[PDB]
Amino acid sequence: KAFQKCPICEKVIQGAGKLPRHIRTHTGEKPYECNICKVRFTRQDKLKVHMRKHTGEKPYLCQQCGAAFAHNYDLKNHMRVH
DNA sequence: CAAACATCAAGGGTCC
DNA sequence: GGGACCCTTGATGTTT
Ligand SMILES: [Zn+2]
Ligand SMILES: [Zn+2]
Ligand SMILES: [Zn+2]
Numbered sequence: 856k857a858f859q860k861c862p863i864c865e866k867v868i869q870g871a872g873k874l875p876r877h878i879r880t881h882t883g884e885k886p887y888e889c890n891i892c893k894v895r896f897t898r899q900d901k902l903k904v905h906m907r908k909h910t911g912e913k914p915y916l917c918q919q920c921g922a923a924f925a926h927n928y929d930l931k932n933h934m935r936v937h
Numbered sequence: 938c939a940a941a942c943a944t945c946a947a948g949g950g951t952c953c
Numbered sequence: 954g955g956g957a958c959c960c961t962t963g964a965t966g967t968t969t
Contacts, residue, residue: 873950
């Protein structure tokens with residue numbers, strides 16, 4: 856696909872609009888905010904996964920028995936138990 | 938005092 | 954560019 860060069864550390868970052876999330880590791884900037892617990896995050900998806908704590912959600916449902924888990928690895932461990 | 942094991946967050950990839 | 958989920962590595966912690 857496409858690649859970018861980091862202006863700060865000469866790192867090569869793959870992704871069209873993915874450079875700013877890499878820059879935020881250097882600037883230490885967390886533009887996103889949890890409306891409930893007010894904790895701030897550098898990436899929107901990291902806020903979304905945090906929101907699964909408040910809005911109790913288990914998207915990783917088991918394809919075998921239907922049980923659902925909040926984290927993908929808890930599903931993996933349950934699947935390996937079968 | 939270590940390994941072993943576990944959980945979970947941080948960076949980057951990859952598709953859509 | 955923006956969402957979103959996956960994968961790898963590492964910090965931190967508990968149990969040997
Ligand atoms: Zn950089
Ligand atoms: Zn919150
Ligand atoms: Zn199951």
